[PDB]
Amino acid sequence: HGYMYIPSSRTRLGHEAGIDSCPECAILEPVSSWPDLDAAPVGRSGPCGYNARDSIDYNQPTTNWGSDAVQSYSPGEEIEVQWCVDHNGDHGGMFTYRICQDQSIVDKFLDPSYLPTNDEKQAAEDCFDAGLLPCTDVSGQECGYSADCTEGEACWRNDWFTCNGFEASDRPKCQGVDNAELNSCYTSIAGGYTVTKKVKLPEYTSNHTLISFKWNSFQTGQIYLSCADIAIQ
């Protein structure tokens, strides 16, 4: 249970606008989430997420999200990205952020009068995967391998970020990355913890595009997706 927090995702805005009672609940399941992190179809979840709790499809703007960029950045800027994990749903695993560099694809997700089909969601997901923002593009950022993976498996990749080990004595799981205080970010079930990293934005301009967060579980078959509206100018 988690969602993207900084920049402010559509899911965060759905919470703050009073629409989404459980932002951390928007989940892609059942799926195979491990060890192949990208094979599972995204279905109705798409790159922005679908929350079954209040029947919210974040792939479509509404009055409450998706209308405009929440934040503006520069091409190639190294930026803070943060997600929020619920205390009762800290799965460990691996996560990443992606930007699709095909504006015409993205445009179908920016139209309050249009809901992308599942096929359009998948074509967009493939563009996002091509646009993954590697951990290793940020000088000095330590980009390790998961304690839940072995070399030779499709999870053995340090373009994705990893949470800390599930079984670690000290600072386990995703909460252990920042070791922040409880309620450092909002979740509805048991309160949230921040999970913070840096990414290098692409050398690409847009007045309105998306960054999509993806978090895959290792111990259960579950993926969490969110997306934030951004500008790169």
Ligand X SMILES: OC[C@H]1O[C@H](O[C@H]2[C@H](O)[C@@H](O)[C@@H](O)O[C@@H]2CO)[C@H](O)[C@@H](O)[C@@H]1O
Ligand Y SMILES: *[C@@H]1O[C@H](CO)[C@@H](O)[C@H](O)[C@H]1NC(C)=O
Q: Write out the residues near ligand Y by the rule CB under 6 A.
A: 205-207, 233
Residue 233 CB, nearest approach to ligand Y (Å): 6
Distance CA 176, CA 219 (A): 17
Taking the least distance from each CB to ligand Y, the nearer of 45 and 206 is 206
Residue 1 in marked binding region:
yes
What is the maximum span of the chain, computed from C-alpha positions, in angstroms?
A: 50
77 binds, among Zn ion, ligand X, ligand Y, none (CB under 5 to 8 A by kind): none
Residues 6 or more apart whose CB falls under 8 angstroms from that of 2 comprise 24, 83, 84, 85, 86, 89, 174, 187, 192, 195, 215, 224
Instruction: Classify strands 71-73 and 223-232 as parallel, antiparallel or unpaired.
Output: parallel
32 binds, among Zn ion, ligand X, ligand Y, none (CB under 5 to 8 A by kind): none
Tell me which amino acid residue 165 is.
G
Residue 38 CB, nearest approach to ligand X (Å): 29
Q: Give the one residue of 39, 52, 130, 189 binding Zn ion; rule: CB under 5 A.
A: 39
Is 104 one of the binding residues for Zn ion (CB under 5 A)?
yes
Is 188 one of the binding residues for ligand X (CB under 6 A)?
yes
Taking the least distance from each CB to ligand X, the nearer of 56 and 177 is 56
Binding mask 166-195 toward Zn ion (x if CB under 5 A, else -) reads --------------------x---------
Residue 224 in marked binding region:
yes
Residue 136 CB, nearest approach to Zn ion (Å): 19
Distance CA 28, CA 49 (A): 8
Q: C-alpha angle 100/159/223, rounded to 5°?
A: 70
Is 21 one of the binding residues for ligand X (CB under 6 A)?
yes
Is 6 one of the binding residues for ligand X (CB under 6 A)?
no
102 binds, among ligand X, Zn ion, ligand Y, none (CB under 5 to 8 A by kind): Zn ion
Nearest-CA neighbor of 93 among 141, 151, 154, 160? 160
Helix, strand, or coil (residue 142): coil
Backbone phi and psi for residue 73, each to the nearest 5 degrees, phi listed first? -135, 175
Residue 13 CB, nearest approach to ligand X (Å): 17
Is 52 one of the binding residues for ligand X (CB under 6 A)?
no
Tokens matching residue 113: 């009068």
CA of 199: how far to CAs of 13, 56, 159, in Å?
22, 28, 11
Instruction: Classify strands 192-200 and 2-6 as parallel, antiparallel or unpaired.
Output: unpaired
Mark the binding-site residues for Cu(2+), compressed into ranges. Answer: 1, 91, 224
- Give the residue numbers of the binding site: 1, 91, 224
Residues in contact with ligand X by CB under 6 A are: 21-22, 188-189
